[PDB]
Amino acid sequence: LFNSEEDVVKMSPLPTVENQFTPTTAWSTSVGSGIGNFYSNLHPALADNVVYAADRAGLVKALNADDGKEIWSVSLAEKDGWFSKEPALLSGGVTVSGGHVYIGSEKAQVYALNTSDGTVAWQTKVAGEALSRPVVSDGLVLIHTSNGQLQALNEADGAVKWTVNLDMPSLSLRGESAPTTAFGAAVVGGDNGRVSAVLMEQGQMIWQQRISQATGSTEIDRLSDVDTTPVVVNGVVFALAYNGNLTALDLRSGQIMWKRELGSVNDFIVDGNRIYLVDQNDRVMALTIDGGVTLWTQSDLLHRLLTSPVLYNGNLVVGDSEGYLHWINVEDGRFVAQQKVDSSGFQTEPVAADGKLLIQAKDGTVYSITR
Amino acid sequence: EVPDNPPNEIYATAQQKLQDGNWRQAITQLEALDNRYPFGPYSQQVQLDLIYAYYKNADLPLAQAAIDRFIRLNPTHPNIDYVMYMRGLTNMALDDSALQGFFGVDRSDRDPQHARAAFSDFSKLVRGYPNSQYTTDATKRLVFLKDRLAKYEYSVAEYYTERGAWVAVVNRVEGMLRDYPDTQATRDALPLMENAYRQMQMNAQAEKVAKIIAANSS
Amino acid sequence: ERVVYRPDINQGNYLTANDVSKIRVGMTQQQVAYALGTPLMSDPFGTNTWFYVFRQQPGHEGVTQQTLTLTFNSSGVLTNIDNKPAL
Amino acid sequence: CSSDSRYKRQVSGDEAYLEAAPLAELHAPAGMILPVTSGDYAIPVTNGSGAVGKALDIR
Amino acid sequence: FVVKDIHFEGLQRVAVGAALLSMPVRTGDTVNDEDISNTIRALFATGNFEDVRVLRDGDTLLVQVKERPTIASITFSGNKSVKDDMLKQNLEASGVRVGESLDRTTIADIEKGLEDFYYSVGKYSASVKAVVTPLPRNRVDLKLVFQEGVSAEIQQINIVGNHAFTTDELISHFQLRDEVPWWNVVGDRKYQKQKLAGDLETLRSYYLDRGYARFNIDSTQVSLTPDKKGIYVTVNITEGDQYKLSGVEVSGNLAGHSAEIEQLTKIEPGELYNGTKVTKMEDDIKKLLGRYGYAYPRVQSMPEINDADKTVKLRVNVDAGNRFYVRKIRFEGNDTSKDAVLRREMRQMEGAWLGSDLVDQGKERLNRLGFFETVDTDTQRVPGSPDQVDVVYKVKERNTGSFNFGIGYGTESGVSFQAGVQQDNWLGTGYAVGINGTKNDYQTYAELSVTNPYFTVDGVSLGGRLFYNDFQADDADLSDYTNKSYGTDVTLGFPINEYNSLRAGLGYVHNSLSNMQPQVAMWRYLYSMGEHPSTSDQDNSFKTDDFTFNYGWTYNKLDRGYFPTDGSRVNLTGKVTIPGSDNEYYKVTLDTATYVPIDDDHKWVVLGRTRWGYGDGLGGKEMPFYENFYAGGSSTVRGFQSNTIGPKAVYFPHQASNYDPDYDYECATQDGAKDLCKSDDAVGGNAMAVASLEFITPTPFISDKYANSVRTSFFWDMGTVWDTNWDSSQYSGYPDYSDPSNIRMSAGIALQWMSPLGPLVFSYAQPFKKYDGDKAEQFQFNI
Known part of the structure; x- marks a missing residue:
């Protein structure tokens, strides 16, 4: 009653919970510390029976992907600077490649924890922390900074290859434009509502396409966590603009194949021809790869902050940042299992790796899920 | 005020409250007449009633705006002889209005700020309408305001004697010189500058004042 | 009368010793007006005399004054450098 | 609730603008005439009267 | 066709x-x-x-x-925090209003700009809906729905490129608030972009005076985090490698004041660099030249930041200007005030050079006026020569008139009334008005206190004060403790400093007493008066005409004469008698007005408000005990009932007051209780030591057009009054009032409401510490 008189606007819950399948967990091994209330694009990785889970608060875990048993644990809570034991404060998600675990920090100081023990098999202070996960690929650590600096490193020491300012809006227009490699070309979206292609070998712009409006004189959405990480099918960039406006366009020239340049889309998979997506309508849709034609759709999850679309246990699986997990029809949009396993909700996305389904919640963090 | 009513009936209700002297209630009609019909035919006459009715209701910030409205409404108009006179009169009421005159206390020592502004409008009347029904009326204010400015200017010239700032004595009376060629307070300010010269040991320059004092003893 | 704390009266519109040596008779008003500017009093009906006169009162300690008037001709060219101390 | 006579409201007003008079023009001898005019303080005197002061009241 | x-x-x-x-x-x-x-x-x-x-x-x-024409109305629904008009200003920005042409196409683009206003104001989680309602003959209502969820709030700051100062304490230097802790509750923590731009310059000033002079903020980027509230922000700076303040090489138009410059350029060569000191020292020169006449002292520093030895070299380019800039001065806001009141309140004189501080001191006597609402001016350099500055002192004046509360028993039940009225320099005419008094059926008091505060040039405060008390306290008649008292005092003000002025004058007082109480300390005072009365009877009449020399002095370096925030004002007071007085005594007293601003914007101010007083006899005769001190329910120790702190009147076992009111006004009298009875009425001691500790606070729920007219202030009231001559050998079975540890405690909040007839103070104060006769009234409703 002592908070019963104030007033804010409202966003709709999740209707039609259906559980024709039984959903379970694979195990629980929650770090607990993790995202929490503090939003970040950090997300775990899962490889080699190791659930690579952690926090930006400092602790690094190696959970055994049978039970989530702690294999090793180190901590990147920083022992020095202006104070001992200051939290890790990580920008990007967990990249695990080779004998290295890479996470970009918000200190712009990046590491390579040797995956077998978590010992920093090399570190590197970099120039500007990332709006993306550190894209460690092809000898290089591809970085889209907070400043939008295309920085490539060497993934054995962090030997910085270049630093190139990208498509840059006014403020930190918060979107993971991860610099992807498509056929030796650095391919990235853009938080300025536009898209670009760059030579991955030296940092040389293949093309840059102005695509969609961003905030400033045409104000667009700040609830859609747009995947400005491009998912290019070999010659056609399939990616989101910073407003979520969709276009299909050539990899090699940027020439528009088709568009749904109307979007508020958050997360997407280009699944074959049937493009599964997350709106900020929070309505699921299967779009087509040749014209974004709705093959099927589902608005059963309106005003839910959902996670990424994944296919697991033969069903389209999606969780939310509320703790609800949903086994969508792979076809038209029916919950075949629905799982409320968390109250903290899942900010990271489902990693359908090691035969499992890894999601890290905000504070009920690591819930490995099966059915 | 008034609902969306017949405008002449609103105007006649206003016209009765003109004859009522119900300036609190006439403007209640006169606004809602022009709140719905400012393009109406007597709505410009409503403003010419309103400048009268504001001043009758002592509504000077409204009498401010309505004149400046009629500046923008009718920059040419025959009734600007009414307007430019009342613009000084609005300033005349705006400058000095206290109840200390009922106690028999002067207000010419108070600021002639709008009295300066009225001194414009009254002179802007008799330049703009030198043949008006208000021309000698404003000129009688222009007679009256000028010495009221001078009695103000004499009062501020007094203190510099009492301060002893004889430099500030001279230039204030020099302002009283260039403004007023006839005011008696300037003739009362006349020997004090001669004192100020003799208090600045400029007695020879003060002797020039004495000959004008000789030329203006009576 | 027996008051001693008398808050001090001061006044400018005057010149210092360099300013007296900075000018000379035959200078124009403008020649003064470049180096010394205007006085804060001139001659309003007689021939132009440029009044740079110091005034000051020390509290129950007398009076302080440096009087300096500068008559030009009708061409505004210097004819007089009057220097005068206090009373 | 109704009150009545003996001074419900205050009264004020004056013809003070009429009560002034144009004052004594200052003569100065030769060599001592200085200017005495500045803008509207040299008033533009024009005639054509109308009723003066509150003797004239219009709409 | x-x-x-x-x-x-x-x-x-x-x-x-x-x-x-x-x-x-x-x-x-x-x-x-x-x-x-x-x-x-x-x-x-x-x-x-x-x-x-x-x-x-x-x-x-x-x-x-x-x-499309006249929009007949535009109605606003849901603008809880935001003003109607600033929303309507966006319509005025988009050229539409009530009476304008409604294009029905022009809904959403302005509605965008309303949400783009919601964007800029600190939210984005707030949407609008303009609704068209057609009104007669073409007209329309613009009903406007406002769907205001919530503003965006500051969440986190990321700072990189900083290497010597911790990010969180840097935020503590900033106003970028994102915390109200659970065992530390402070003001709130929302967002504004103006906070960001300013606290950048807090950081810009931060590394500056450390020594970092190649310090530069590289960039900063605020997170457009997809939640409508998430404000994280990257800050990119360059630390910039602290430099040693190694030398100043000022020159320019030094105007022969070069030595005076050099004291202002006293630095330590090789000390860590302080550009704020440079920022200060430039102004000091501009105050140095501002008092020397140079109204336009152009001072251009150039720190030659020598990174080769990690130092910095201060070139400073000086252009002083002319001297005799003060031609004359003008004044505005005098349309009710006296010009000579204004003109006497200046120190920089016309026809002079610039002493800039005398303007500010001339502004400060206007600040210390209290009959103003704004102190301002217009220091206009009149064009032409650089000797023509005409300073147009436009100011806003203040109000006048005040009335005392509390009047009468009944309405026509015997004409009794309590009065008091102050016309506040008689509407600012130079005639200070303080008038009070009361005529009742038990006592009658008259008083005047008039002053021409500047009757002559020396601040000459022609303070004439008279009183007349026909005081009987008629219980049945004058038999019960009458003291008629009457007399006068003329007092003057004196040139002491420019912030100090003395008070001195001579007080006449004639008293006429009849048959006062069986209080033994009254009898003891009568015995100290060499008078030998009857103690068991109120039968003793007395006439006395004392002749006293009063004195005092004012200090004045507190902010405003009516609404101060900072400084202090010391108020010396007191009286002594003369040869010729019918009683030989003294009394000294002083109360303070001290302002300790908690805010450096001085919006929170600790108030130092204390009261000190002491009086005694000069020898032989003693101070009258009506000249004692009283407290509680009173001046700023209150929340009690009136004057309920002090010693008590222990009554004699009494017989005849020439009438007791017969089981009314019993004084251990013929009507029973014939014994020594200590009173509950605080008859006060010969020494005053009381205070109140008050705290200026605003209230964030009042419109600040008149919240600034209001001083809300909590307090704590404490202290005692007690008599240094109290000899508890006689008060052996009674308390001692030679004790300074009779200290009460009351606390509460004071509420200054500026009514049109001056401010109105009302308060509630609970005393949680009481003593003998500390009678209570916690709600206090005053003028």
Whole structure:
């Protein structure tokens, strides 16, 4: 009653919970510390029976992907600077490649924890922390900074290859434009509502396409966590603009194949021809790869902050940042299992790796899920 | 005020409250007449009633705006002889209005700020309408305001004697010189500058004042 | 009368010793007006005399004054450098 | 609730603008005439009267 | 075709002939159907014709139009925190209003700008909905729905490129608040971009005076985090490698004041660099030259930051200007005030050079005026020579008049009244008005206190004060403790400093007493008066005409004469008697007004408000005990009932007061209780030591057009009054009032409401510490 008189606007819950399948967990091994209330694009990785889970608060875990048993644990809570034991404060998600675990920090100081023990098999202070996960690929650590600096490193020491300012809006227009490699070309979206292609070998712009409006004189959405990480099918960039406006366009020239340049889309998979997506309508849709034609759709999850679309246990699986997990029809949009396993909700996305389904919640963090 | 009513009936209700002297209630009609019909035919006459009715209701910030409205409404108009006179009169009421005159206390020592502004409008009347029904009326204010400015200017010239700032004595009376060629307070300010010269040991320059004092003893 | 704390009266519109040596008779008003500017009093009906006169009162300690008037001709060219101390 | 006579409201007003008079023009001898005019303080005197002061009241 | 006539339908604001000018066709001009369509678009280009159908009756045109004009109302719904008008200013920004032409297309773009206002104001989680409601003859209501969820709030700051100062304590230097802790509750923590730009310059000033002079903020980027509230922000700076303040090489138009410059350029060569000191020292020169006449002292520093030895070298370029800038000064805001009141309140004189501080001191006597609402001016350099600055002191004046509360028993039940009225320099005419008194059926008091505060040039405060008390306290008659008392005092003000002025004068007082109480300390005072009365009877009358020399002094370096925030004002007071007085005594007292601003904007101010006083006899005769001190329910120790702190009147076992009121006003009298009885009425001691500790606070729920007229202030009240001559050998079974540890405690909040007749103070104060006769009234409703 002592908070019963104030007033804010409202966003709709999740209707039609259906559980024709039984959903379970694979195990629980929650770090607990993790995202929490503090939003970040950090997300775990899962490889080699190791659930690579952690926090930006400092602790690094190696959970055994049978039970989530702690294999090793180190901590990147920083022992020095202006104070001992200051939290890790990580920008990007967990990249695990080779004998290295890479996470970009918000200190712009990046590491390579040797995956077998978590010992920093090399570190590197970099120039500007990332709006993306550190894209460690092809000898290089591809970085889209907070400043939008295309920085490539060497993934054995962090030997910085270049630093190139990208498509840059006014403020930190918060979107993971991860610099992807498509056929030796650095391919990235853009938080300025536009898209670009760059030579991955030296940092040389293949093309840059102005695509969609961003905030400033045409104000667009700040609830859609747009995947400005491009998912290019070999010659056609399939990616989101910073407003979520969709276009299909050539990899090699940027020439528009088709568009749904109307979007508020958050997360997407280009699944074959049937493009599964997350709106900020929070309505699921299967779009087509040749014209974004709705093959099927589902608005059963309106005003839910959902996670990424994944296919697991033969069903389209999606969780939310509320703790609800949903086994969508792979076809038209029916919950075949629905799982409320968390109250903290899942900010990271489902990693359908090691035969499992890894999601890290905000504070009920690591819930490995099966059915 | 008034609902969306017949405008002449609103105007006649206003016209009765003109004859009522119900300036609190006439403007209640006169606004809602022009709140719905400012393009109406007597709505410009409503403003010419309103400048009268504001001043009758002592509504000077409204009498401010309505004149400046009629500046923008009718920059040419025959009734600007009414307007430019009342613009000084609005300033005349705006400058000095206290109840200390009922106690028999002067207000010419108070600021002639709008009295300066009225001194414009009254002179802007008799330049703009030198043949008006208000021309000698404003000129009688222009007679009256000028010495009221001078009695103000004499009062501020007094203190510099009492301060002893004889430099500030001279230039204030020099302002009283260039403004007023006839005011008696300037003739009362006349020997004090001669004192100020003799208090600045400029007695020879003060002797020039004495000959004008000789030329203006009576 | 027996008051001693008398808050001090001061006044400018005057010149210092360099300013007296900075000018000379035959200078124009403008020649003064470049180096010394205007006085804060001139001659309003007689021939132009440029009044740079110091005034000051020390509290129950007398009076302080440096009087300096500068008559030009009708061409505004210097004819007089009057220097005068206090009373 | 109704009150009545003996001074419900205050009264004020004056013809003070009429009560002034144009004052004594200052003569100065030769060599001592200085200017005495500045803008509207040299008033533009024009005639054509109308009723003066509150003797004239219009709409 | 050619048009015979144009059927001018549908105007609703616009004149027909002006619309005929908008029509390319004009009543006999040649008509083609393209010009008909040109007549269509031009009425659309008029911006008032919601439909245009220029048609024709064969060749004569017939224009059918629907009208955009006057919006008859624009009604706002849901603007809880945001002002109607600033929302309406966006309509005025978009050129629409009540009475304007409504294009029904112009809803969403302005609605965008309303949400783009919601964008800029600190939210984005707030949407709008303009609703059109058609009103008579073409008109429309613009109903406006506002769907205000919540603003965006500051969440986190990321700072990189900083290497020597911790990010969180840097935020603590900033106003970028994102915390109200659970065991530390402070003000709130929302967002504004103006906080960001300023606290950048807090950081810009931060590394500056450390020594970092190649310090530079590289960039900063605020997170457009997809939640409408998430404010994280990257800050990119360059630390910039602290430099040693190694030397100043000032020159320029030094105007012969070069030595005076050099004390202002006293630095330590090689100390860590302080550009704020440079920022300060430039102003000091501009104050140095500002007092030397140079009104435009152009001072251009150039720190030659020598990174080769990690130092910095201060070039400073000086252009002083002319000297005798002060030609004259002007004043405005005098339309009720006296010009000589204004003109006497200056120190920088016309016809002089600039002493800039005398202007500010001349502003400070205007600050210490208290009969103002704004202190301001216009220091206009009159064009031409640099000797013509005419300083136009426009100021805002203040109000006047005040009335004392509390009047009468009944309405026509015997004419009794309590009064008091102050006309506040008699409307600022130079005639300080303080008038009070009361006529009752038990006592009658009269008083005047008039002052020409500047009767002559020395601050001469012609303070004439008279009183007359026909005081009887008639219980049945004058038999019960009458003291008629009457007399006068003329007092003056004196030139002491420019912030100090003395108070001195001579007080006449004649008293006339009849048959006062069996209080033994009264009898003891009478025995100290060498008078030998009857103690068991109130039968002793007395006439005394004392002749006293009063004295005092004022200090004044506190902010405002009416609404101060900072400084102090010391108020010396007191009296002594003379040879010729009917009683030989003294009394000294002083109370303070001290302002300790918690805020450096001085919006929170600790108030130092204490009271000190002591009086005793000069020898032989003693101080009268009506000249004692009293407290509680009173001046700023209150929340009690009135004057309920002090010693008590222990009554003699008494017989005859010449009438006891017969089981009323019993004084251990013939009507029973014939024994020594200590009173509960605090008759006060010969020493005063009390105080109150008060705290200026605003209230964030009041409109600040008149919240600034209001001083809300909590307090704590404490102290005691007690008599240094109290000898508890006689008060052996009674308390001692030679004790300074009789200290009470009351606390509460004071509420200054500026009414049109001056401020109005009302308060509630609970004493949680009480003693003998500390009678209570916690709610205090005063003037």
